[PDB]
């Protein structure tokens, strides 16, 4: 069920997992949805991605207060664009520890974003260096290589069938790869397939801008990227 809470929408995906959705008008595009995640890990909550704005991100924290009423231990942001990083100051005002790809933090200022407090680094095969992601509990963080951006990262939730490609993965009906502006058309297809191979148990693929999809979103994305090589 899609729970309306001020101008945002919350949908439960699993017993301990919810999707947050926020909207931003843009001319030529309409009121664009952006999704992130909320995970309960025992007596704390973990957030993946801000909303577009501080006010929206403050409303996510208000929804967590009312519907979960446990402290938010940390948030991880999946790339340095407004839809996933626009509410960083709201997280910092709430005393929430914040994490992003080192490259996301490096890009933040030129992208008009506020950097996270902590930088994630990755091994050669894409898995997060554990020292950089302390206390992440069931959040598994994977850098698939460059795609929608150079810095895009992905998350799976241990003990669920859920993984989140952020803006790397398009829905199975999408007509294009969308934002080519900061994209890596050469490496995109390999990056999409690497996400799939990182999270083989994830039957539910949470989309950046639409409803959850099947792993057909991953194949469709890879095939669309194969055309741009
Ligand atoms: C026009 N437009 C932007 O300038 C920025 C975004 C956010 P991202 O680049 O992270 O997808 C964005 C996201 C989705 C859409 C959809 C209506 C096509 C447009 C968007
Ligand atoms: C046409 N179009 C889409 O269908 C989907 C998106 C969002 P994403 O890059 O995450 O797929 C999208 C994002 C940005 C743009 C921007 C150039 C303004 C177009 C887009
Ligand atoms: Zn983006
Ligand atoms: Zn996007």
Swiss-Prot record:
- MF terms (GO), sorted A to Z: beta-lactamase activity; zinc ion binding
Query: What's a GO biological-process term for it?
Result: antibiotic catabolic process
Kindly state which keywords UniProt assigns to this record, in alphabetical order: Antibiotic resistance, Hydrolase, Metal-binding, Periplasm, Plasmid, Signal, Zinc
Q: What is its main location?
A: periplasm
Question: In which compartments does the protein localize?
Answer: Periplasm
Cofactor, how bound (note): Binds 2 Zn(2+) ions per subunit.
Q: Where are the transmembrane segments?
A: none
Which annotated residues bind substrate?
A: 170, 179
So where does Zn(2+) 1 get bound?
79, 81, 148
Name what cofactor the protein needs. Answer: Zn(2+)
Detail which positions bind Zn(2+) 2: 83, 167, 209
Q: Which reaction does it catalyse?
A: a beta-lactam + H2O = a substituted beta-amino acid
What's in the GO CC field?
Answer: periplasmic space
Q: Quote the record's activity regulation.
A: Inhibits by captopril, thiorphan, dimercaprol and tiopronin. This enzyme is not susceptible to inactivation by the beta-lactamase-blocking agents clavulanic acid.
Q: What EC numbers are recorded for this enzyme?
A: 3.5.2.6
Could you describe the subunit structure of this protein? Monomer.
Extra remark beyond the main annotation: Enterobacteriaceae carrying this gene (identified by PCR) have been isolated in Sweden, India, Pakistan, Bangladesh, England, Scotland, Northern Ireland, Australia and the USA. The organisms they were identified in were K.pneumoniae, Enterobacter cloacae, E.coli, Proteus spp, Citrobacter freundii, Morganella morganii, Providencia spp and Klebsille oxytoca. In India most isolates were from community-acquired infections rather than hospital-acquired infections, indicating the gene is widespread in the environment.
| Function in brief | Confers resistance to the different beta-lactams antibiotics (penicillin, cephalosporin and carbapenem) via the hydrolysis of the beta-lactam ring. Does not confer resistance to the polymixin colistin or the fluoroquinolone ciprofloxacin.
Its family? Belongs to the metallo-beta-lactamase superfamily. Class-B beta-lactamase family.
- State the name under which the record lists this protein: Metallo-beta-lactamase type 2
